[PDB]
Amino acid sequence: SSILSEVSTRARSKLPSGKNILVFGEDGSGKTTLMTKLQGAEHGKKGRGLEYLYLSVHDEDRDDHTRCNVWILDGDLYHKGLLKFAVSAESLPETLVIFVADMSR
């Protein structure tokens, strides 16, 4: 049997995927505005709870486009449990944490 399977098993290489970005910013600190500006959209949606966006990243060297996960988290400690929802042990080593700090206040 196999053979077909084992020769299939020798996949040549891989491109990075499945990264993740987290954040906090106080309620309405333009954090949604920034995140939506990164992928180019003028504005997303200002809501409550954990939100979710993209980062389309393109490399001309690899000629590759990838979607980097963005988990923008709203303010208020009442949603702290969603962070238990927003991180796994396997997700941890692939997570880049951005913060927000507006100088309005």
């Binding site: 040549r12 060297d61 690899r62 000629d63």
Partner: protein, 48 residues
Amino acid sequence: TSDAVTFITYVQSLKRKIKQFEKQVELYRNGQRLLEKQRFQFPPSWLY
């Protein structure tokens, strides 16, 4: 001094081929990156 001048004329001969090998490197960067975006199974013997 014969040995030194032999080495010198050898490296001078190398001087010309320097640029040819440079453009060889560039075009192979071209071809290799293309073959990657052409997604070919670079052999195990393939020298990176």
